[PDB]
């Protein structure tokens, strides 16, 4: 990379990962529109086996960056509404609280307080009907944001219905393939498995657990390559060949909802640009990221606006991950580590390389 991009790159993440000891992380830099890439440490300690390009990592809730663009790229195609009702797409679900709760309120989690996660005890597509037929909102629909992968993996859920397809093949069809993200799974091949990182907490190696939703929610698996083309992807849309796929990319930056300084977007999320640093960095911790807070509906909701700064933290049991970009400027970043560190420590490094880039 250029001697300034490796500098920056360097200066920052050295001293994060010895402060974290974050076992292996890749890190992708894209510059006037070109990526650069970065690794350091073990993607499997006990085998000694190094961070690469090609280490797919648990991307966490990031993967609900790539469920927003399948809703949008299905609202695209016809195929559903963000305005339909919950209920067009789930004619079983009959509890009286889900009148008023549109796919909407599913994404962006504002239907009124569905849970940050779906119980273990829930297996089944009975056992989903039935927790979702039990849910009691604790407030209107359109009035409160509570982040919620019970939410946002019904929206994906049910997005998918009408193409008849599996979430992981609408997925696959309709995302994936389109961008060359060839090395981006829901579920990792058997082939790709000697590239699969393990993830560490409290120094114990784990992958994510099976559980509902979890495609939707938080179970995607990604390189360094392809989450740098993702990134490239979402700053400029436009350039996408596939006319639904480049809507759907712009329908997920747009802005929904307001909470404080935050925007909120399908499985992105978005500031003005140019953000103070604090309200970003302070504001990715999860004693703020996963409160309830009251929302301002933008009405309509405004088009993708490129002077934003646009970003999504994940995170499984052993990974933690963070992208974050600027249309305006052609810049992103992708940080991906496996540990789950905290989320403000992300964001901070990110807005220390961005910043001197800018
Ligand atoms: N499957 S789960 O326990 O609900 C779960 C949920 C998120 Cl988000 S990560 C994770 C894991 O297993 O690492």
Known sequence: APQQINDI?????????EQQKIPGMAVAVI??????????????IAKKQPVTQQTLFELGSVSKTFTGVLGGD????????????????????????????????????????LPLQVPDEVKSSSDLLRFYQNWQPAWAPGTQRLYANSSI????????????????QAMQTRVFQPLKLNHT?????????????????????????PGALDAEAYGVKSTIEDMARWVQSNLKPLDINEKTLQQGIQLAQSRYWQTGDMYQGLGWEML?????????????????????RP?????????????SWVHKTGATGGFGSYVAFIPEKELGIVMLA???????????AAWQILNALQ
């Open 272 to 292: 003005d640009w140019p953000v103070n640093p604090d309200s970003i960095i302070n504001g990715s911790d999860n004693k703020i990221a996963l409160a309830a």
């Open 185 to 209: 799974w829901i579920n990792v091949p058997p082939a790709e498995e000697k590239n699969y990182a393990w993830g560490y907490r409290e120094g114990k190696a784990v992958h994510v657990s």
């Open 74 to 113: 299905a609202i695209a195609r016809g195929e559903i509404k963000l305005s339909d009702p919950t209920t067009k797409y789930w004619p079983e679900l009959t509890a009286k609280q889900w009148n008023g709760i549109t796919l909407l309120h599913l994404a962006t989690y504002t239907a009124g307080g």
């Open 338 to 348: 496996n540990k789950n560190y905290p989320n403000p420590a992300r964001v901070d």
């Open 295 to 307: 929302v301002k509906a933008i009405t309509p909701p405004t088009p993708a606006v490129r002077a």
């Open 9 to 17: 790159v360097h200066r920052t993440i050295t001293p994060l990962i």
């Open 153 to 168: 993996g019904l929206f994906g859920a049910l997005a998918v219905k009408p193409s008849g397809l599996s979430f992981e």
């Open 31 to 44: 510059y006037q529109g070109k990526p650069y890439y970065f690794t350091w440490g073990y993607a499997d």
